[PDB]
Amino acid sequence: ASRLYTLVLVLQPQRVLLGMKKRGFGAGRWNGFGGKVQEGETIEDGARRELQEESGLTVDALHKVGQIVFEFVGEPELMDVHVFCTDSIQGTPVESDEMRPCWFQLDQIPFKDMWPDDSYWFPLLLQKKKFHGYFKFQGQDTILDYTLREVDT
Ligand SMILES: Nc1nc(NC2CC2)cc(-c2cccc(Cl)c2Cl)n1
């Protein structure tokens, strides 16, 4: 059993857009835009919806770059996160209060205040790779094990 999620990274050559989650699961961490995919909606439609809802941005196209499965030890349900990137945004970020948006220079990505897994997979988005990942967590802060299967693009 798994629950499906999306994550969208607005990635330009000089910078990336991240959001800080203000409350709920992952509050206090910079991340892409995303959330749970709903019954009856395709993964890409859910990615677009979450991007709109959280940042007020629409996009012409999304591109799939990766999938990551997360296991929390002791919990039966896996998280299955589909990761997309875009540089085709319409509008300018609108600050919700699920997320606080902020652009970051690519050599100033705030890894210490991101989910720990991002330190492993996020550089793959800069390194011309698509990937499938699996991370075993013990609580929220501790990676016990991970795997990454990567292909150069
Ligand atoms: N970068 C990153 N890393 C994550 N690490 C998993 C241990 C939590 C989870 C998420 C994420 C993605 C989409 C929706 C939601 Cl709720 C989340 Cl939490 N993002």
UniProtKB/Swiss-Prot annotation:
Subunit text: Monomer.
Annotated N(6)-methyl-AMP binding sites: T6, K21, W115, P116, D117, D118
A cellular-component GO term for this protein: nucleus
Protein name, entry field: Oxidized purine nucleoside triphosphate hydrolase
Effect of G35F: Loss of activity
pH dependence (UniProt free text): Optimum pH is 7.8-8.2 with 8-oxo-dGTP as substrate, and 8.0-8.5 with 2-oxo-dATP as substrate.
CDD domains assigned to the protein according to its UniProt record, in alphabetical order: NUDIX_MTH1_Nudt1
